[PDB]
Design a protein around this nucleic acid. Structure first.
Lengths: 441, 441
DNA sequence: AATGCGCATT
DNA sequence: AATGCGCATT
């Protein structure tokens, strides 16, 4: 109605309604309000198909859905069976030819009579993920249909229409060529965000820029401006899962991943740019709204963790008084570049992607190719596409073009008592919010 | 003539004859003195076939030799061609089915009319290795032939006859069954050393004890005695090549390799046992008898080295005034367990084996199997097989059963200036003994 | 889940 | 030199 960012969280059961006024539930997303639906498409990793269908309004529940997943075999047959009762639901397996890869992108295409809406978010399609957790949502505006006679690209300065199409053609699934053509007939020119995809593969030369962290690096080179005293502006990475990052920080994180994030403006330098990583403590999960059960969505393995204790001295607490979400655990992923006083940020990103090489990609064969395992997707917010140099941090979440950060800044470092949440090991010592212990059976 | 150990060095050209009285050249080994030869066998890694043949006395030069190597293809055809002129020389390639494996064992079998002599040493069969270097030699005594009528094992308390046979059958080469039967007809009972082989493969259960460092561990359990204050007796490893030992000391060296070395007596404990590794500095090679050319036989690669700078704080200088060999570089390998004051040693080993997992073996598939790449071989000296508790270090090399250590004790740690010798990188800064620089072309 | 990258001598 | 061990998700 008023604001430029179109950036929202999910409704959280069990907090003061102060905080959920201006958040969204999935039903609010699929409301008649947002136009008379014709068909949808749902990209995601996990699906409760019965629950999902109940989230659409009765008026629209018979209209086609295409589900886009990466599952195979028994996971596949369970999904296919779970969707058998509904004659309007179709499916599209997306090809995951590298191992340990996930179809992790979370996105709704929503076709109406009145236009198109694209929605990029961070929540799985199961009840537990929209209940008591802290998630991220971006809404496009309604994209009007292009008149049949007229000839217009329907493109924005951020090249979003063209960046999104490239993302979908990369699948090769026939079921999506329908959704490419749908997008081609629609005017996407009002879009003020840049798209950031990861798609699986191994990419060489000029192709490395297309996906992953080289994509972010390129965008930041071409569309960010180098600030005075830039080296003192830190990086902040926020996530719910942790992949294997190697033997020490030089192997990937503080070399290859951090380079791409700190890039700003065309001129390149070749640092002590502080990196603050945010990941819930054991104690943040203990005192949570769910308690230890929140550990269900925080899958840091003990085997992965003990390999890399070096990482943990970069780890800071979940803390989100600005949203009243300190006890609603993070399944959102975000990355941003603040000023040293944290009053302003050069850019913000929300995405599906975790702190993993699978998701962001990592280099192979001596710097020549970039391998990515997983499908991911996010939107980047840049001041340059709003005629600004920086955003200003909304000191409290809920006054014009000041960006709404969901967590508290500055991040607070782990105490000596603190260790990170790990779902493999049993927490038997102190009980959770609801008087339970944790034994991963 | 007098002594019990039978432990010698090679003659070194360019030192005071004080030091070479009581050392040996290869011709001294193959002399008529040691019996009228019938045929020999020569196990080794590198061979100069023309030079070799010239080391035998003219009287014996026509008598059969079998060469035992691991080379294949062009290395093979070069060797086969190089031995073509001599109708008495035969060959035996030994099978190296794991990759990066070497046939590294250095041993002479020497058949005479009057008996058998086995000789286990550390020098390759090329002129450069017997010239100005510091090497190790063990001679058996003359093993008399067993009378055809009599029935006697010909075995010693150290089970050497049986340990050696097992070593040769492990090859499967038909050419060696002749040498097994030769050994079977001979009395090896006077042997006061234990044999220590590495042969290539992957070994499970009770088989792990047969080879490598599990072999040493087993021998030390069964035939050494646990001293009072044993944890304060250090370990000392001396070598010319360095394999890849992993990301840190826990991966192999200070866990798996060091355990096996410090074992003593049946009772097991489960430490700060100091480990002193001896490897020439850049400066030890610079000031050497050869100069930088000595770097030819010290093949520590820059790629291997930079992976493991942690190792280098265990590194001590080559220093051997006791032998007048400080400038003759080490191609010998030795390991031993001294007392904290270094006056006495629990045991001594000379061997072909370097500080590598290839040579010593390392564990796979979670502690169940031990993999070895290479063929190696040494003799272990134990006081228990001489009715003693310890040896006493010969304060100066050249008074009854005091053991002759070739290097100076205690070892001296690297200075801040010092770095290890590495043959990949160019030493262009200060000239060597003969006014040359080093550029590895 | 099951492919292909990186590794390992003297 | 060219085999097979170990690795990599949310």
């Amino acid at each position: 109605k008023g604001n430029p960012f179109q950036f929202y969280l999910t409704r959280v059961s069990g907090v003061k309604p102060k905080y959920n006024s201006g958040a969204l539930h999935i039903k609010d997303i699929l409301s008649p309000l947002f136009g008379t639906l014709v068909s949808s498409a749902q990209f995601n990793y996990c699906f409760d198909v019965d629950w999902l269908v109940k989230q659409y309004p009765p008026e629209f529940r018979k209209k086609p859905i295409l589900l886009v997943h990466g599952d195979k075999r028994e996971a596949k047959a369970h999904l296919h069976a779970q969707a058998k009762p509904y004659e309007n639901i179709s499916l599209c397996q997306a090809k995951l030819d590298i191992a340990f890869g996930t179809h992790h992108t979370k996105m709704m295409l929503l076709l109406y009579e009145e236009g198109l809406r694209v929605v990029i978010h961070t929540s799985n399609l199961i009840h537990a993920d929209w209940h008591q957790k802290t998630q991220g949502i971006w809404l496009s505006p309604l994209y009007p249909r292009i008149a049949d006679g007229t000839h217009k690209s329907g493109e924005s300065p951020t090249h979003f229409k063209a960046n999104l199409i490239s993302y979908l053609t990369a699948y090769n699934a026939p079921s999506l060529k329908e959704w490419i053509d749908v997008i081609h007939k629609h005017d996407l020119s009002e879009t003020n965000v840049y798209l950031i995809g990861s798609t699986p593969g191994r990419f060489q030369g000029s192709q490395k820029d297309n996906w992953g962290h080289f994509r972010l690096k390129k965008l930041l080179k071409d569309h960010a401006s180098s600030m005075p005293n830039a080296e003192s502006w830190p990086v902040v990475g926020q996530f719910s899962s942790v992949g294997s990052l190697g033997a020490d920080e030089s192997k990937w994180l503080c070399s290859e991943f951090k380079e791409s994030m700190l890039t700003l403006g065309k001129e390149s330098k070749t640092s002590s740019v502080p990196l603050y990583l945010i990941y819930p403590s054991v104690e943040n999960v203990r005192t949570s709204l769910e308690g230890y059960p929140a550990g269900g969505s925080l899958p840091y393995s003990i085997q992965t963790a003990e390999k890399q204790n070096w990482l943990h001295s970069y780890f800071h607490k979940w803390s989100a008084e600005t949203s009243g979400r300190s006890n609603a655990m993070p399944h959102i992923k975000t990355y941003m570049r603040p000023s040293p006083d944290f009053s302003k940020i050069a850019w913000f990103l929300v995405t599906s992607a975790n702190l993993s090489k699978a998701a962001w990609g990592a280099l192979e064969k001596n710097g020549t190719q970039l391998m990515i395992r997983s499908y991911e997707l996010g939107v980047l917010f840049l001041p340059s596409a709003l005629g600004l140099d920086s955003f200003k941090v909304k000191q409290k979440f809920f006054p014009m073009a000041t960006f709404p950060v969901p967590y508290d800044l500055p991040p607070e470092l782990y105490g000596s008592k603190d260790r990170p949440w790990i779902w493999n090991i049993p927490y038997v010592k102190a009980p959770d919010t609801h008087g339970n212990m944790w034994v991963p059976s």
